[PDB]
Amino acid sequence: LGKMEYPPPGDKFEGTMEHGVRTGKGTYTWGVSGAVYTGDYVNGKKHGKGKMVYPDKGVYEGDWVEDVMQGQGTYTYPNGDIYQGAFWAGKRHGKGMYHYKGPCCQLVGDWADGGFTYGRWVYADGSMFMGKFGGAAADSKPTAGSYFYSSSSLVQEGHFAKDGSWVGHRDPAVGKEFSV
Amino acid sequence: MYVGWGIKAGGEWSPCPPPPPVPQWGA
């Protein structure tokens, strides 16, 4: 239970220690910036469920596996965007959903290494795109799939060009909003 | 005088892509 502090502002650990090594709930507060962590430990490494406040106010709440964000979690970014889903190696990976705050649009489906690769992108009004997105190499830009626009209820399948020009395979038709 | 639909011509328009998803703190 030794509140082992570290004078340089300086660190302030406030938790439990089994003869030095950390294990159990604790609140470690870095002093260089202000990033705090409240959660479990194993061998001193942040492990288990634990909330973190980063220097730039980006908050995280979820699982950690050996000091890195792993498993299920929820991140609130400094601008306001939110992510809920699977982290792996400290990034977005697996299945999850991302909500922008400005446009109020959302991305839902399969991520890969911090970037969005497959699934749906829906707007605030209900319109959506579904299909293969760019990824982390690109900037989550759509690559190949179908657009559904709700106001007109139209559905067009196609892909994009290197310049970003939408290229429709056929003319639009009347359809529904990709509940696949 | 203007009489029309209000649509600029030139073929220089294409759909807007999603904003870039914010990266993590430690880059």
Partner: protein, 252 residues
């Protein structure tokens, strides 16, 4: 029931939609249309539209025909097109092959206004030179097969199996609905109307007090049709560069 659209009423009703012609061209048409109609042996000849050009000499296009017949489930009109750049002297607008139709379909932008110009296309590097009048004729063909609007049940089939005006036509019951109008090439009694078109490619504004409906094409912005129900007249006109609107899904 009219027997043929009247250019005066067309220009009067569709002027609010910006579909206008110059004053000199209006007078010149009033003289030139009958001359060409007679010396070509045609029963009908009307002003189809006006395509804008880069040098200010817009192409006026006129369309005429003699008789329409039912063939293979379609009301085929053996139409013939003429063009002009002053409204006084009409020249022929000759048909284009199918192979060249694709190439001219690939050419975009506002026309030059020089009937002797020819554009260039490149393929696997074989270069083709496509005359400007070819591009004009194909844009006209595309716009025509897309719109060609008449009221529903305004035509009828006669004993010789020809499409003739229905002189007992009483009018559209509901002029503000797309069911009241149809394509010209749809047989009478076939039940195919503009409501069978892709939903969202037509707009209808109906002034229920004066009884004038305006049908605008959104797929080919520039095609306007009017229908006056108290006098039972109707007619259409195209005014614009002739290019299709491909971004329609993003604009609705």
């Amino acid at each position: 029931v009219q027997l043929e659209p009247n250019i005066t009423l067309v220009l009067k009703h569709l002027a609010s939609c910006g579909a206008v012609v110059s004053a000199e061209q209006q007078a010149a048409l009033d003289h030139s249309i009958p001359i060409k109609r007679i010396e070509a042996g045609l029963r009908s000849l009307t002003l189809w539209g006006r395509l804008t050009t880069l040098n200010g000499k817009d192409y006026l296009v006129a369309e005429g025909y003699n008789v329409a017949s039912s063939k293979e489930g379609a009301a085929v009109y053996e139409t013939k097109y003429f063009y002009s750049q002053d409204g006084a002297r009409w020249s022929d607008l000759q048909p284009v092959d199918s192979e060249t139709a694709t190439r001219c379909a690939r050419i975009k932008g506002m026309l030059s206004g020089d009937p002797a110009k020819n554009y260039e296309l490149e393929e696997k590097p074989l270069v083709f030179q496509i005359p400007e009048l070819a591009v004009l004729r194909c844009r006209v063909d595309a716009i025509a097969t897309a719109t060609s609007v008449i009221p529903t049940d305004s035509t009828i089939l006669n004993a010789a199996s020809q499409v003739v005006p229905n002189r007992l036509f009483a009018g559209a019951a509901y002029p503000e609905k797309l069911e009241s109008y149809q394509h010209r090439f749809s047989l009478p009694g076939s039940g195919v109307t503009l409501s069978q078109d892709l939903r969202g490619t037509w707009a209808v504004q109906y002034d229920a007090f004066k009884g004038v409906a305006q049908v605008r094409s959104l797929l080919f912005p520039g095609y306007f049709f009017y229908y006056a129900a108290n006098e039972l007249t109707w007619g259409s006109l195209y005014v614009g560069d002739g290019l299709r609107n491909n971004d329609l899904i993003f604009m609705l």
